Amino acid sequence: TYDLSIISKYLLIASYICSYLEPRYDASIFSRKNPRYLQPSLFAIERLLAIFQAIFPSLMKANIEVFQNLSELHTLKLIATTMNKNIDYLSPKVRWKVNVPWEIIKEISESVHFNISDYFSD
Amino acid sequence: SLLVKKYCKMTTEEIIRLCNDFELPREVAYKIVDEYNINASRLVCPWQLVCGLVLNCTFIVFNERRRKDPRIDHFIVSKMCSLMLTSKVDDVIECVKLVKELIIGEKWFRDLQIRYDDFRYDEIIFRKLGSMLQTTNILVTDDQYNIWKKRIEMDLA
């Protein structure tokens, strides 16, 4: 059962969503208006906070501690850069990706009482 | 529940009826017609937008009384909750929070704040600045306390 905090826990649970998901489908199915086996896809920045703001219990707006736990998660090597480990800060072309298998995601979903198996649909 | 009975036009005679009771001056009373005419084209529901704009300007044109009397803030919304025959005060505040960001990218409100000189200004330039000398509202302020004082001690003697 992983050490990380609650907002960082939901930070992990949004990062696993773009495993088998692509930008062609996500904005339709997560509107405000199976690759469980396969290798994970590539992120960009702010697609996290696109999904993070949606799935959090207007109740949150300050994102200073949310930006804190990203590079906390970068030191844990649970989400790593596609390129070399140097310039990833300033938004040049940098793609991100998870490195955690499905089971540790599945326990950490129920550890914060959040349901994830609904949104994975072959 | 007149606010949820949507898709009705508030004509030029109809909208000036909706603002002469809330005591709007001629500067904004034409502007409400001006920006409804902006938003008569791209609307979704005409009842929600027409009331959301009239509250925040009365929040900013009557703030020389609103910051000096907290009781009239319920008075202005409940007299519209009786006028629009709303359900409760839950849905009406949901409107005024909504359209406020929807009018924050326009021109005239950035004028209407700085034309009316209304706001208070030196608080916000010290709140957003992160001043250690900003007002902490664990207190009641000296004016409102003196408003409390002169009301009570003359009620006393």
């Binding site: 938004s91 | 924050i104 950035r110 916000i124």
Partner: protein
């Protein structure tokens, strides 16, 4: 003038002293607690590094320090007739199998000559260390940040150390400073080497937050440093509950930061801070007497006074009609000790050893005390059920405490410590009126340069065309003001030839547009996708 050259150096209170006697005195309690865990971490490694005599004696001893912050320093015993050296290998110094060997042999070798009073930097020195330096060798490996290294390099590294096990005058010891996730580590390595690792492993936990043995301790030593001279309000402490829960690794350095900054706020604005010692009663003034009046518990008790005593001639006299009795009405309630501090210290040591309970947070224990939820606090062990009546305290509604208190009733240290970063930027660019108050008449009829496109920048698509955005940008600029602006100056000549040109307005727009979108790249708001084409860009910044 010189700003394009990088890093050029150049060589160009009655209230605050009462802070100074309080601040450092608190900080003597801080750092003395800091060396306690510093002596704790240095102790528990040291005994466990020794006295472990295994029977096979052909295996290194490994130590996994779970939960450790990758900065844990270690001291070693002297242990004469044998040198004991420390090598540290940072993932920055882990490029390959090769230089991980070569720098590490270099790092001990200079450490070997300095104690000794040409050679080759590989394992050749390791066997001849008996002859090269006399006494034997016991090296230790402070792997600082172990999960960032490519583990096959680490797995190939430890097989290289396995070959050194046949010389019998050298002893190896490995220190694995993981950040977390021991189960992750047994996944990454080769399984043939885990069986090499599993001879004598020790899973010692080192965490700053371990059952709150120091978290509840440092808040406790905070309370006695401010004992009786202040209070801690309910909305303040829940901020300390919520925000400190968002940082798992180092609460203890954070609780020093947000508390001491909170104390810095009190001394900098509150005038009654001088009166926390009763010797300062001679500094009393009518200006101090005027500002005491607007306290909420002051005026509420007067409302309590009139309804209790419907005769108000006494109450009117003790108002500003008198001033000597008026301050005497204040200093009646001046010395209020507020035993919620002492009642906390009463119950803190109790359940620590009477019921002997350790999984508890003293701050919410102080917070549940502030509402009266201490009964619904002890329930989570059902062990104070024989003691809920003797550890009972109803929090009394104390009087005049709003002058000696700390609370984020203004949202100050919410803002200045945890700032809503991209919220405050985006609020600065849509509104701009509450930040900024001949040519200023143009400013009252024209927005500033950065913000005027921002309203259309919201109203633009995901990927946008450059020129049509400028075409929309030219709509927001009215024509008569610019020619009034470009012809404002008769003194300059070089501008004035541009001022009389009939296409000056459409030229000065693209100049001004290429100073603003030029300035939206260092902020990272807009990214130039597919360079040397730059016909379309991408906007990442959304409102939320």
């Amino acid at each position: 003038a010189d700003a394009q050259r990088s890093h050029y150096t150049v060589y160009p209170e009655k209230r605050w002293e009462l802070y100074h006697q309080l601040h450092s005195h608190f900080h003597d309690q801080v750092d003395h607690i800091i060396d306690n865990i510093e002596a704790d971490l240095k102790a528990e490694i040291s005994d466990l590094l020794y006295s472990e005599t295994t029977q096979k004696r052909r295996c290194f001893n490994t130590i996994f320090l779970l939960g450790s912050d990758s900065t844990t320093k270690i001291e070693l015993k002297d242990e004469s007739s044998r040198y004991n050296v420390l090598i540290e290998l940072t993932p920055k110094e882990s490029p390959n199998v090769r230089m991980m060997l070569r720098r590490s042999m270099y790092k001990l070798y200079s450490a070997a000559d300095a104690e000794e009073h040409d050679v080759s930097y590989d394992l050749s020195l390791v066997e001849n260390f008996k002859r090269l330096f006399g006494k034997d060798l016991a090296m230790v490996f402070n792997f600082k940040d172990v999960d960032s290294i490519n583990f096959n390099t680490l797995d190939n590294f430890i097989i290289l150390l396995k070959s050194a096990f046949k010389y019998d005058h050298v002893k190896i010891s490995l220190i694995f400073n993981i950040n977390t996730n021991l189960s992750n580590i047994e996944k990454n390595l080769r399984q043939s080497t885990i069986r090499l690792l599993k001879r004598n492993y020790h899973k010692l936990d080192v965490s700053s937050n371990k059952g709150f043995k120091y978290g509840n301790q440092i808040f406790q030593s905070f309370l006695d440093t401010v004992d009786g001279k202040l209070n801690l309000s309910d909305r303040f402490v829940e901020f300390i509950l919520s925000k400190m829960a968002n940082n798992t690794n180092h609460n203890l350095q954070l609780l020093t930061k947000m508390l001491d900054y909170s104390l810095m706020s009190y001394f900098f604005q509150n005038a009654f801070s001088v009166f926390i010692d009763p010797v300062n009663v001679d500094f009393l003034n009518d200006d101090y007497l005027k500002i005491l009046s607007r306290c909420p518990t002051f005026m509420f008790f007067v409302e309590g006074l009139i309804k209790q005593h419907a005769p108000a001639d006494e109450i009117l006299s003790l108002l500003t009609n008198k001033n000597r009795g008026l301050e005497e009405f204040f200093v009646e309630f001046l010395v209020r000790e507020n035993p919620i501090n002492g009642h906390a210290k009463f119950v803190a040591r109790f359940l620590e050893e009477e019921l002997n309970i350790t999984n508890f947070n003293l701050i919410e224990l102080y917070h549940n005390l502030l509402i009266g939820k201490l009964d619904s606090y002890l329930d989570r062990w059902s062990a104070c059920k024989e003691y809920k009546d003797r550890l009972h305290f109803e929090p009394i509604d104390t009087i005049f405490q709003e002058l000696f208190t700390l609370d984020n009733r203004s949202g100050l240290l919410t803002q200045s410590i945890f700032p809503s970063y991209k919220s405050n930027i985006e609020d600065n660019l849509l509104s701009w009126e509450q930040v900024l108050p001949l040519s200023g008449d143009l400013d009252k009829i024209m927005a500033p340069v950065l913000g005027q496109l921002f309203k259309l920048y919201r109203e633009a698509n995901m990927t946008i065309n450059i020129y049509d955005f400028y075409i929309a940008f030219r709509e927001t600029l009215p024509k008569e003001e610019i020619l009034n602006f470009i012809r404002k100056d008769p003194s300059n000549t070089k501008l004035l030839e541009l001022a009389e040109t009939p296409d000056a307005f459409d030229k000065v727009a693209l100049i001004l547009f290429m100073q603003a979108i030029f300035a939206f790249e260092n902020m990272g708001l807009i990214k130039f996708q597919s360079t040397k084409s730059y016909d379309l860009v991408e906007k990442c910044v959304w409102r939320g």
